[PDB]
Amino acid sequence: DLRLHLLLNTSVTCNDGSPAGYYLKESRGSRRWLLFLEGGWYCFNRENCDSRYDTMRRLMSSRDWPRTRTGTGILSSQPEENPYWWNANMVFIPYCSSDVWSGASSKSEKNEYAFMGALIIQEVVRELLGRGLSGAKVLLLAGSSAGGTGVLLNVDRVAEQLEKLGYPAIQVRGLADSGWFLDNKQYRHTDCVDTITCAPTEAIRRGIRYWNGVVPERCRRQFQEGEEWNCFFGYKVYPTLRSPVFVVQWLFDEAQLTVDNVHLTGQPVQEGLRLYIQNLGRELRHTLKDVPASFAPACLSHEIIIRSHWTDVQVKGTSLPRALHCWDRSLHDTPLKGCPVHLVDSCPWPHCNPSCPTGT
Ligand SMILES: O=C(O)[C@H]1CCN(c2ccc(Cl)c(C(F)(F)F)c2)C1
Ligand SMILES: *[C@@H]1O[C@H](CO)[C@@H](O)[C@H](O)[C@H]1NC(C)=O
C-alpha cells in the first residue's frame, strides 16, 4: 500500500483549491524512484469543468481521496506482478488539475479553478528530496493517458529542477504510456462542443490558453508564441527532449479514436472506416520509427502500465517489463543480444497481435 501525503505547500493545489498530494511506498536500500502521473481526460472551459466537478470530483479535488492506495502493475511491489521494478520506491501522483499536467495557474478572483499540474510535479519532487529522493540514482517519471503526455511535457523540467537544486547524479528518465497522440483529422467532423469528441488540435489550442499551460522550452522555441499547442503532440515534442524517454502506445488507442469521433459498434466495419483505422495505425507506426525505446502493440485498448495484467502483452515475443529491463541495461554507463528495446507492431488491424488485452 502507498500512503497519501498532501503537499506541505498548500499553495500548490488541485482544481478547487484543495491541496494536491502524492501516495508513497518507500523501499529503503533502493535508489530507484518511480513517480507515476495518473490520467483522466481534462477540461478546457468553465462549462465542461463545472460538469466534471459535479460527477468526476476526485479528478479535481483531494477532499475525498483515501488515505491509501494499492500499487498495481508497474507500481506493484510483487515481482510476479511487476518483473521490472518491484523493489523501487513507488509514488502515485493523482491527477487533480485537469490540464494534461501542463498548468501553472492558481485559483484567484479571475480564475474559478487552479490549473497547476506542472507545479504539482515540481512540488512533489521537492518534498520527496527530503524523504529519500536525494539519494536516488534513477528517477523514472512515468504516466498513463493524460499522464503519459504529462511525462513528455515535464520530464526535462524535472531534470532541470534537480540540476538547479544541486542533484546532478540523479538520472531522470521518462516512461510515457498512452500519451502519444496524433493531431489528425476526425473520421466524422464534430464541432468542439464538449470534451471527449473535440478534435485533438482544437482541444489543446483551447486548453493551453485556459490552463496557462507550459511546454518544454526547446519545443516552445521552435513553435513560438501562439503555437505551443504543438508541443502536446509526442511526435513533435519528443525530438526536442534531452532525457531518455520510453514510449508505450497502442497503435489503435481508444482515446485517440474517441477524439477522432470513431465508435466501434461491433457492427460490420465499412470501407471508409476500415481505411481510416488502417491509416491511423500506419501513421502511428511511422511516428515511432525513430523512437529507439518504444513498445507499440497493434491493439484497440487504453492504458497499460498500472493494470495488474500489464505483463501479458508481447510484441515480437517480448513483454513490456522485459523491454523496460532491456532499456535499463541499455542506459548502463550498441544493441543487446536477445534484449530488444524497439518493439513496434507492423500488422495493420486491431488484435492482429494475439496477445492484445481481451477486454474480459
Ligand atoms: O487521460 C486520458 O484518458 C486521455 C484522453 C485524451 N487525452 C489526450 C491527451 C493529450 C492529447 Cl495531445 C490529446 C489530444 F486529443 F489532443 F490529442 C488527448 C488523454
Ligand atoms: C509554494 O509553491 C509556490 C509555487 O510553486 C512557490 O512560489 C512558493 O515559494 C512555495 N512555498 C514554499 C513555502 O516553499
User: 262 with 276: CB under 8 angstroms?
Assistant: yes
9 CB under 6 A from ligand 2? Answer: yes
Cβ < 6 A, ligand 1 pocket: 39-41, 100, 145-146, 149, 181, 200, 203-204, 232-233, 255, 259
Q: C-alpha distances in angstroms, 13 versus 16, 61, 66, 92, 222?
A: 7, 8, 17, 16, 31
Which three cell numbers mark 10?
498548500
Residue to probe by mutation, ligand 2, list 6, 7, 11, most atoms within 8 Å of CB: 11
Other beta carbons within 10 angstroms of residue 9's beta carbon come to 14
- Give the whole-angstrom CA distance, residue 308 versus residue 229: 33
CA distances from 345 to 34, 39, 175, 189, 195 (A): 27, 24, 19, 29, 30
Please tell me what resolution, in angstroms, this structure has: 1.2
Phi, psi of 283 (to 5 degrees): -65, -45
Helix (H) or strand (E) holding 286: helix 271-288
Task: Name which residue sits closest to atom 6 of ligand 2, judged by CA.
Answer: 11
Burial bucket for residue 74 (CB in 10 Å: 0-12, 13-18, 19+): buried
CA 355 to chain CA mean position, Å:
22
Q: Which of these is catalytic: 156, 177, 253, 260?
A: 253
Residue 145 a catalytic site member:
yes
* Residue 8 alpha carbon to ligand 2 centre in Å: 10
Contacts of 28 (CB under 8 A, 6+ apart): 132
Separation of 327 CA from ligand 1 center, angstroms?
A: 26
Q: Is 302 a catalytic residue?
A: yes
Technique used by the depositors = X-ray
Count how many Cα atoms sit within 13 Å of the Cα of residue 319 in the half-sphere of its side chain. 16
d(CA 25, CA 69): 10
Whole-angstrom distance, CA of residue 339 vs CA of residue 167:
31
Separation of alpha carbons 244 and 101, rounded Å: 19
The angle formed by the CA atoms of residues 268, 271 and 272, to the nearest 5 degrees, is 110
